[PDB]
Symmetry: C4
């Protein structure tokens, strides 16, 4: 059951990368 966990974790990370890109766009809209 490691693999079903690792799978979700990968998916979790990928959300965090997508969040980082939302915050890159936002920081630029903000003048930083």
């Amino acid at each position: 059951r490691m693999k079903q966990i690792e799978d979700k974790l990968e998916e979790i990370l990928s959300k965090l990368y997508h969040i980082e890109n939302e915050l890159a766009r936002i920081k630029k809209l903000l003048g930083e």
Copy 2:
């Protein structure tokens, strides 16, 4: 405990989609203003 883990996984995944959608609304609000 695996069920518990798996709940916790999902609960994290939901707060992530919620986070992403509150960011995406902030982003739209700054892009149109």
Copy 3:
């Protein structure tokens, strides 16, 4: 080794709650 994982997961969640509070403060500073 479930418990060492569940532990980190709890900790992960707690970060996400803290992020939500950062975004509550920010949304109000933004007029929403």
Copy 4:
């Protein structure tokens, strides 16, 4: 795989502290402006 899991846990935990700190800088920037 547990080592892999444990790496992945930590990698998520780092992007979380990084996320939190970029939010905290945005928050300061809007509170002082």
